Amino acid sequence: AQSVPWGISRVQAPAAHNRGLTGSGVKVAVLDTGISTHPDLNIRGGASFVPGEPSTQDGNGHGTHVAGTIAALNNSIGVLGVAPSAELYAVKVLGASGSGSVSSIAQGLEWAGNNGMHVANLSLGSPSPSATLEQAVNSATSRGVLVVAASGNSGAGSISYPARYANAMAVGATDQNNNRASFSQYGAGLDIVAPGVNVQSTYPGSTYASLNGTSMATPHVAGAAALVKQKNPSWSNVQIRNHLKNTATSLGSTNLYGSGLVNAEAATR
Amino acid sequence: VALXPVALXP
Ligand SMILES: [Ca+2]
Ligand SMILES: [Ca+2]
């Protein structure tokens, strides 16, 4: 039977699904370690920019887990994504070890902009800025891509890059009580938060795993953006971004939580 | 560097 992970319920995705909003027709690029073929995922395509790993299959597990939060299929098995009918593209920019270069990430962002992706999920970061990365985020934004990125897991009061760049939407992590997870980076630039503790999702080997981190929070927001895009196909990346923020549930200080907890019901009503 | 598994530059 299919389970609905706590985080999917918390962001109120089922209410959106009841309106017929599932992310149908919306192209979402997952810039990560790959996405492995899985009975609870439909992968529409992708590309790899990691030397030595020509396929988009996932040798780490991280990308597959992130992908299932966005779009695990609505059926009789596994779990359920925020946007179960979104069109997932696997853009491999990190290797099986979990590391990548700024060059590979920038190639992924260029690919997303050149190939019509509307949302790009970046569950990755670095404590250091890179002009190359900044330019790539800005270029993708100008081509219509909503770039969604994780705030980081150091627990500090400043956020990682690329999330810290203006044109990336930065996502922090909450726990089961809507508290900021202790590891979740916060501070100037934080846009919004989403569940990032004990997140069950798809994992390679046709199985499921529960993981923690801002990497897991981020795809809740990427998924919510796809729901808004399906409802409002003429809306631009920045319009979608602001609408998600404006309809978020305030949790207190914008410094700790940004606009608050993403709410897919409010964002699609 | 990095958050958990993803790092990129220092
Ligand atoms: Ca399922
Ligand atoms: Ca930002």
Domains in chain A: boundaries: 1-269
Of A148, A131, A116, A117, nearest in space to A215 by CA: A148
Residues of A with Cβ-Cβ distance to B4 under 8 angstroms: 153, 213, 215
Of A115, A257, A141, nearest in space to A189 by CA: A257
**Cα-Cα-Cα-Cα dihedral of A261, A75, A3, A199, to 10°?**
-50
Q: Is the Cβ pair A185, B3 closer than 8 Å?
A: yes
Between CA A123 and CA A135 the distance in angstroms is 18
Residues of A with Cβ-Cβ distance to B1 under 8 angstroms: 126-128
Between CA A94 and CA A191 the distance in angstroms is 25
Q: Give chain B's largest Cα–Cα span.
A: 14
Residue in the structure block whose two tokens are 């993803």: B6
Query: Could you write out the three-class secondary structure of chain A?
Result: CCCCCHHHHHCCHHHHHHCCCCCCCCEEEEEECCCCCCCCCCEEEEEECCCCCCCCCCCCCHHHHHHHHHHCCCCCCCCCCCCCCCEEEEEECCCCCCECCHHHHHHHHHHHHHCCCCEEEECCCECCCCHHHHHHHHHHHHCCCEEEEECCCCCCCCCCECCCCCCEEEEEEECCCCCECCCCCCCCCCCEEEECCCEEEEECCCEEEEECCHHHHHHHHHHHHHHHHHHCCCCCHHHHHHHHHHCCECCCCHHHHCCCECCHHHHCC
Contact call for residues A98 and B7 (beta carbons, < 8 A): yes
A19: tokens are 């309106």
Between CA A157 and CA A139 the distance in angstroms is 28
CA distances in angstroms from A173 to A24, A193, A257, A269, listed in the order given = 26, 5, 9, 24
Query: How many Cα atoms are found within 13 Å in the side-chain-facing hemisphere of A255?
Result: 3
Q: Is the Cβ pair A213, B4 closer than 8 Å?
A: yes
The H or E element spanning position B10 is none
Which residues of A are marked as active site? Answer: 32, 62, 215
Contacts of A72 (CB under 8 A, 6+ apart): A40, A41, A78, A79, A80, A81, A84, A201, A202
Beta strand A192-195 with A199-203: parallel, antiparallel or unpaired?
unpaired
Nearest CA in chain A to B6: A124
Between CA A228 and CA A267 the distance in angstroms is 7
Residue A79 alpha carbon to ligand 1 centre in Å: 4
Enter the resolution in angstroms: 1.5
Q: How far is B7 from chain A (nearest CA, A)?
A: 5
Q: Give chain A's largest Cα–Cα span.
A: 47
Residue A167 alpha carbon to ligand 2 centre in Å: 6
Phi/psi at A165 (nearest 5 deg)?
Answer: -70, 140
Compare CB distances from A127 to B1, B4, B5 and report the shortest one's residue: B1
A117: tokens are 């992706």
Q: Is the Cβ pair B1, A126 closer than 8 Å?
A: yes
CB pairs under 8 A between A and B: 61
Would you tell me which CATH number, out of the four given (3.30.1490.20, 3.40.50.1580, 3.40.50.200, 3.40.190.10), belongs to the domain A1-269? 3.40.50.200
Between CA A264 and CA A138 the distance in angstroms is 26
Residue in the structure block whose two tokens are 């780490």: A60
Q: DSSP letter at B3?
A: E
Sign of CA dihedral A233, A238, A243, A244: positive
Between CA A138 and CA A177 the distance in angstroms is 35
Q: Is the Cβ pair A60, B5 closer than 8 Å?
A: yes
Of A91, A83, A113, nearest in space to A225 by CA: A83
Contact call for residues A46 and A28 (beta carbons, < 8 A): no
Contact call for residues A3 and A200 (beta carbons, < 8 A): yes
Residue in the structure block whose two tokens are 């590979």: A104
Compare CB distances from B8 to A101, A153, A213 and report the shortest one's residue: A101
Between CA A209 and CA A219 the distance in angstroms is 15
Nearest CA in chain A to B5: A98
Technique that determined the structure: X-ray
Most B CBs within 10 Å, among A92, A99, A171, A203, to test the B interface? A99
Between CA A5 and CA A157 the distance in angstroms is 29
Compare CB distances from B6 to A123, A154, A185 and report the shortest one's residue: A123
Contact call for residues A244 and A222 (beta carbons, < 8 A): no
A184: tokens are 């979740």
